A paper describes a structure:
In this study, we solved the crystal structure of EcHpaB apoenzyme for the first time by X-ray crystallography. The N-terminal (MHHHHHHHK) purification tags (residues −7 to 0), Met 1 and the Lys 520 for each chain were not observed in the electron density maps and were excluded from the final model. Interestingly, the low-homology sequences of EcHpaB and TtHpaB enzymes results in highly similar three-domain architecture and 3-dimensional structure. However, based on the secondary structure prediction, the EcHpaB β32-β33 loop appears to be segmented into three sections, two random coils were separated by a Type IV β-turn.
Among them, the HpaBC complex from E. coli (EcHpaBC) has outstanding activities and a broad substrate spectrum. More interestingly, we found that EcHpaB is also capable of hydroxylating a series of phenylpropanoids to generate a wide range of natural products.
Numbering used by the authors:
A (entry chain B), B (entry chain D), C (entry chain A): 2 to 519
């Protein structure tokens, strides 16, 4: 239904059509109250408007070369390049750039925009035979995602379970089959960390292994659920947009006020999923293989790496400008700290380069980005983000903490007269501009919005051990570790306890002095 | 007169009397509006109530052994132990314990409480001759601060200057003498980072060297200013107390709601400072020597190290309880991360031990804490705090980011029915307890309050290079580096290019094979 | 009989008597050859002479105040302070200073000197009743170690086992009882990392649990073995002393040439252990409890922390002297790096202060150092050492790598004429002094000796996880974690989902705006 909000079948949503598609009576709660309409609600309206700008850019002629491709469906339409299966290394590079162009529209701050799950559509389109009996749903869903620009999110993290409850009760926490019917399946359960689901059309409800499920294929499900389906509910976390709106201003919280992606709990209360929305049904094997063989996990980290690099573009220059304000950019050591930030920004662009240039042919003509680069991004990003934030905080030693409370302070001459005198920029800018730049930096790192972004980046791919284990596993599974080991084994083979085994090196029996010494 | 709110002259304020002394028409601005009364204002009332609890504790029979001493003034009254000059190492240990018992009343979160500037009073009482003409002011201010428990703060950080403006304009930014009169001195200027000054009685206005002052003794001042003096004004930063009250709850922000210390700009607009409040007057020599020779900088770091250790007590156990919630404390690697947190917590307690055990006699019977330990605390605290915060964030991989917005969600059964089943604690606690614990942890690290505390801890003592230089200077100025070097010089003297110069070691001419080889 | 080389029973060995006591036909191998006499052998002679200097210091009149105490045995003699049981905190402080004065004699580089296992003697003396049937052996060995200064080492680390071998054959790797006889017990097995055991009188052979022992009390042993007992053999690692002697000089390797402590494999081939040397016999319970209850592990980390702090004294001043040579000490950033090394140096001294000041009474009047400080030292030392070495390496950007090969280059005028011109010190010292200083720095960090010292310091106490787990366990077992948790529980008790539960704070029902906003 959401796609019927388009006035045309040969392009994705416009911003206006996307916003109207959200006025569907989805069930959302925040601060104990039900949200009437996310496009007008104080907690979501600007964040939704920010996403709508992404859809608008798709139809601006000066954007289309970098953003858009013809569809591969025969419709004659166009779409964002990352929504269509890449068939070469050059195609992936064009997708990498289209992702970048969309990230710039939120300065890298919105991470779960529609291009993230576009890789899921491409995975369905490239490898639909994975789903066996549900292959045709996969084919149909790729076309619909590609042509419409449908906004998906991924709901996969299981809720916590009380390890003291009887196992028979603890399992009613996970997504599970309740009833198999001719119209589809009725399911119940919950997922956590449904980031920006309040603004999506559909969520993919994905399998997460839990040891308490044991056997029981009723937990081994993967399906699509529309956000307006009866029994789908979101319980929202606190809204940095609404708090910034209620007690601040755009000047005081310039990022919180427009880029907040609410991390919800998604509840499924006896929801009917039609069969055409089912992708994996009572199949532990396919569920367990999906991460490696489905394609999605091998594609979306291109988007996540690019989005981060665009954010690091922003953070780098925002730091430089902030240090011009305080005047500490004159110092050699301060310049060096900024230089390391530059180096981290460079790193993730270079990884995304390598993802594309080393892309490999897969099934049905599709190309996958370099897999080792995907794992390397996942490992490095939490380290770099923590280091950059530390570099920022130790280099604005004082400018951030005493900033006047409010744009209201500037608009009250009784107060502004003193601000204009005592809080000018060191480089000749006035107090208004200095306070503006530093409040922007604070909203990036120290506001509750900034705190959440740090926590999100650090834990994006899992625990610190898990992402390093996954990097090791890719090296072993691809044969890289064996090739590295062949080099070590060759070295070991060139000598033994009696000397060299290869002819070009000199044994030391003519110069060894141990007999003489002992 | 502020102490005249006391019903007795033989004890410091009670909580009630402290609050009443704050209803004095001090001029404070926040969110473009003037504050009528900090004890009732939504941005300050709970923080003020939290400080008042400190004054209440001084008179509780169960608290008095650890908190209070007789005064040394002949009044026969008692006071907080850190308000009276320590006359032995055991006295410093009793003061460290008195500081600790007071920090626990804010769980380590309020750093700029009345005991911080109590060391300033003790410096004045211990070394009054430093001030020459103003020695009697120093003596009297010691008596007054000690007997009454007056709440001082320290305002020293100069405001920023626009380096493009004519030097004639840059100097009316700094504290400076306007006019000398018989009733006192008239001063103008500003200071930044006036942490919790809105809740104090007096601010001590301290000299900060700026290269633009050059000569001109009109900048070389140190004096005391009351908060309600005509022309004294505070410009407040955003209030985390008020925002948590307006859009949250104590359940949702248990630390922001009661422990926020607003970091203000302090403005002096042609303020009359009476002579009895002047400590250094048109004296660059005394101003530049005061940090090293006055005593205060050699005393207050004991309070800061202890307060940090109490917060680390709290953070350590709160992390443990958070990992009990999520169930990841079962993992060996998670337990190891917690153990490192324990190690950092132990470190700062151990530093405070060394401060007292290695204390040195100073002037007039007063004792100073170990100077090297103070410098070491300053260097380690930014590293430890940043490291601990990272350990916390990477170990609550998911529990923090999707927490329901509001206690209102728990109090709406339509919503609470789902929270009760999907967000239980892993260790058998219910969803209310789990969400509460994790919201307390988030307010510690990720809320705007948590973000500010991180930035405060990192920059407390200056830039990262500056605190390390201060540590180096103390080792050199104290003779420590010379003693270390004497060992290196001894080692170097025991051999030369011909062999050993000491009799007990064997030269290698009987075993050296180089002639043989070459 | 080893003590019978003393000309007096009222003092420990002199250096000369210690060296003579080592000429006993102990069976030691290195470079495939048997060692005739460790006191003359090119791999051990200077290291033995360096230990002999410790014994000589015990009898120099100017050293005796800091090094020596009367014995507590009634003999009327004296001993090194750490060899006699401490009965107060002040005694522990005197011991720490006595340890320091001995470590300064190798500039902190010999770690396994006789004072290390002196804590083992004191443990036997303080808690001899632990050993039941062997209580009198414990008493006698305390008396003997204390009065004579006998040199013990600790051999505890089990050798590796091949997990593919039959469990019956895997068991012959560990120390185990072979036969009980009338004169004592016959044992076989091995231990690894027997650091400097080649220069000791006795080794204490300690129980290390291996899962393959299972039951079988034949493994549950603790006993003392003399180094010259038939069947005791050491298999040595490479000798940095001998390599420095054969291809270097004291000028070229001033630390390798005299302070190398060879980390041997200790082999027991059917060794007869007399009953008077047995401490724990076929007793798993006592073996498992010994680490916690024996006392030794609660004592020797004082010695280890002090030795490290003395080494860090040396490294700190050696780095400063190196940066004067290179001229980079002029830079602000270099001075700051040096300042951080200073801070780490201060930290371990401060930890040793806290060990003594917070000492606790134990059994039979003995005092134990503060336990949390011991665990904190163990955790911080590997971090501090790796950081300090990296700091050193990044600050001598070129001076270390091209240093001329040999003192022979200086003594060849054909070569020295260029060195005198091209390798002077930046601070006016000649090339001989500059090259000498930088080679001393290289031997500390980059020589094979320096490389081993980095590996030893990093792994001294076990794996990085294990030492953090021990720190956590101490916090929990001591009640510290419960005391920290009581603070978190108090904070949690002061509010619920309906507001504050205490009267002094203001509820926000009067300022909450959510009803108005939603």
């Amino acid at each position: 239904k959401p796609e019927d909000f388009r006035a045309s079948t040969q392009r994705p949503f416009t911003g206006e059509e996307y916003l109207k598609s959200l006025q569907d009576g989805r069930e959302i709660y925040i601060y104990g109250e039900r949200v009437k309409d996310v496009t007008t609600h104080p907690a979501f309206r600007n964040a939704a408007a920010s996403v709508a700008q992404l859809y608008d850019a798709l139809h601006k002629p000066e954007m289309q070369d970098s953003l858009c491709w013809n569809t591969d469906t025969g419709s004659g339409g166009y779409t964002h390049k990352f929504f269509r299966v890449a068939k070469s290394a050059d195609d992936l590079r064009q997708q990498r750039d289209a992702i970048a162009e969309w990230s710039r529209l939120s300065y890298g701050w919105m991470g779960r925009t529609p291009d993230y799950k576009a890789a899921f559509g491409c995975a369905l389109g490239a490898n639909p035979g994975f789903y066996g009996q549900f292959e045709q749903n996969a084919r149909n869903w790729y076309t619909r995602i590609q042509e419409t620009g449908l906004y998906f999110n991924h709901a996969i993290v299981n809720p916590p379970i009380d390890r003291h409850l009887p196992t028979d009760k603890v399992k009613d926490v996970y997504i599970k089959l309740e009833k198999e019917t001719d119209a589809g399946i009725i399911v119940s359960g919950a997922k956590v960390v449904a980031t920006n689901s309040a603004l999506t059309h559909y969520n993919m409800i994905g399998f997460g292994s839990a040891q308490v499920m044991g056997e029981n294929p009723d937990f081994a499900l993967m399906f699509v659920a529309p956000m307006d389906a009866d029994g789908v509910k979101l319980i929202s976390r606190a809204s940095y947009e609404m708090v910034a709106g209620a007690t601040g201003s755009p000047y005081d919280y310039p990022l919180s006020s427009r880029f907040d992606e609410n991390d919800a709990i998604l509840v499924m209360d006896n929801v009917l999923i039609p069969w055409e929305n089912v992708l994996i049904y009572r199949d532990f094997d396919r569920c367990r293989r999906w991460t490696m063989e489905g394609g999605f996990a091998r594609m979306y980290p291109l988007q996540a790496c690019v989005r981060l690099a665009v954010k690091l573009d922003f953070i780098t220059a925002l730091l430089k400008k902030s240090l011009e304000c305080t005047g500490t950019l004159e110092f050699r050591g301060v310049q060096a700290d900024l230089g390391e930030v530059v180096a981290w920004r460079n790193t993730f662009w270079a990884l995304s380069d390598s993802m594309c240039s080393e892309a490999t042919p897969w099934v049905n003509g599709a190309y996958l980005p370099d897999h080792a680069a995907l794992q390397t991004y996942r490992v490095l990003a939490p380290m770099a983000y923590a280091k950059i934030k530390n570099i920022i905080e130790r280099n604005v030693t004082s400018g951030l903490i005493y900033l006047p409370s409010s744009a209201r302070d500037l608009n009250n001459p009784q107060i502004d007269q003193y601000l204009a005198k005592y809080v000018r920029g060191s480089n000749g800018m006035d107090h208004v501009q200095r306070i503006k730049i530093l409040k922007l930096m604070w909203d990036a790192i120290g506001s509750e919005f900034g705190g959440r972004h740090e926590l999100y980046e650090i834990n994006y791919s899992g625990s610190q051990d898990e992402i390093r284990l996954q990097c090791l596993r890719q090296a072993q599974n691809s044969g890289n570790m064996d090739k590295m080991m062949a080099m070590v084994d060759r070295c070991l083979s060139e000598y033994d306890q009696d000397g060299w085994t290869v002819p070009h090196l000199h044994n030391n029996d003519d110069i060894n002095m141990l007999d003489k010494l002992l």
